[PDB]
């Protein structure tokens, strides 16, 4: 399927949404950064 927001992923394709993108986190780890208009 596809992860959500702040979810740990490896590829942007993993992040769900219209044009979501997988990026880093804060403690080195990685997380998603969807653009859900709602939440």
Overall morphology:
globular
Instruction: Report the count of strand segments.
Output: 2
Radius of gyration: 9 Å
How can the largest sheet be summarized? 2 strands, antiparallel
Estimated share of beta-strand residues: 15-25%
State the distance separating the first and last CA atoms.
18 Å
PDB class: toxin
Keywords: sea anemone, disulfide-rich peptides, ICK scaffold, TRPV1 channel inhibitor, toxin
Assembly: monomeric
Entry title: Structural and functional characterisation of Tst2, a novel TRPV1 inhibitory peptide from the Australian sea anemone Telmatactis stephensoni
Q: How do the helices and strands line up, and which of them pair or pack?
A:
Layout: E1 22-24, E2 30-32
Antiparallel strand pairs: 1-2
Please give a structural write-up.
The PDB classes it as toxin. Keywords: sea anemone, disulfide-rich peptides, ICK scaffold, TRPV1 channel inhibitor, toxin. It forms a monomeric assembly. By secondary structure, the chain is an all-beta fold. It has one domain. The chain contains no helices and two strands. Strands 1-2 form a two-stranded antiparallel ribbon. A hairpin with a 5-residue loop joins β1 and β2. The protein is globular, with a radius of gyration of 9 Å. It starts with 21 loop residues before the first strand and ends in a 7-residue tail after the last strand.
